[PDB]
């Protein structure tokens, strides 16, 4: 029923297209698409609070966290609304994204429309790493590509 889309671009080679679809109110959201130009392995994959790309991906601010929780993985109760874990790039540098999530929404206060989707330099340790930054950012490092999340036809 509701479809939303994000074009990921950055200052380097990373680029992608991510689609979101929600068949019903407060239903699960299907997330799918492709990202290229990545180093092989895990890359943190988050909805950030601001749809502000004025000075590139840094303008997007922290993880989208309307419920003031700590950082976690998508399968954790203790998570930011924006915590979609990691996407995994193969040896060609391509991540084929296929996620279903029950916490993000395309309506209401969990809505991600008008926020920024970010793919990160490093793996998200899903809040299980050895330090304080783990339960804020997951230690996923710099922002390789981002886009504002928009309404699709």
Ligand X SMILES: COc1ccc(CNC(=O)c2ccccc2[SeH])cc1
Which residues are known to be catalytic?
Answer: 46, 48, 63, 71, 80, 83, 120, 143
CB within 8 Å of 113: residues ≥ 6 apart? 4, 106, 149, 150, 151
Contact partner, 148, from Zn ion, ligand X, a second copy, none, Cβ < 5-8 Å per class: a second copy
CB of 107 to ligand X, least distance (A): 5
Nearest partner of 118 among 64, 78, 37, 72, judged by Cα? 64
Distance CA 64, CA 26 (A): 17
Residue 63 DSSP symbol: B
- Residue 113 binds ligand X, judged by CB under 6 A: yes
Flag whether 43 is marked binding. no
Write out the residues near a second copy by the rule CB under 8 A.
4-5, 7, 17, 49-54, 61, 113-116, 147-153
Residue numbers belonging to the annotated binding site: 46, 48, 63, 71, 80, 83, 120
């Amino acid at each position: 029923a509701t479809k939303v889309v994000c074009v990921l671009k950055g200052d380097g080679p990373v680029q992608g297209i991510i689609n979101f679809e929600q068949k019903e109110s407060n239903g699960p959201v299907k997330v799918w698409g492709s990202i290229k130009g990545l180093t092989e392995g895990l890359h943190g994959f988050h909805v950030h609070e601001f749809g502000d790309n004025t000075a590139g991906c840094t303008s997007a601010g922290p993880h989208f966290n309307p419920l003031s929780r700590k950082h976690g993985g998508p399968k954790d109760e203790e998570r930011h609304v924006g915590d979609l874990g990691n996407v995994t790039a193969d040896k060609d540098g391509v991540a084929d994204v296929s996620i279903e999530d029950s916490v993000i929404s395309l309506s209401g206060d969990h809505c991600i429309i008008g926020r920024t989707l970010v793919v990160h330099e490093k793996a998200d340790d899903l809040g299980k790493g050895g330090n304080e930054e783990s339960t804020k950012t997951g230690n996923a490092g710099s922002r390789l590509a981002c886009g504002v999340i928009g309404i699709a036809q």
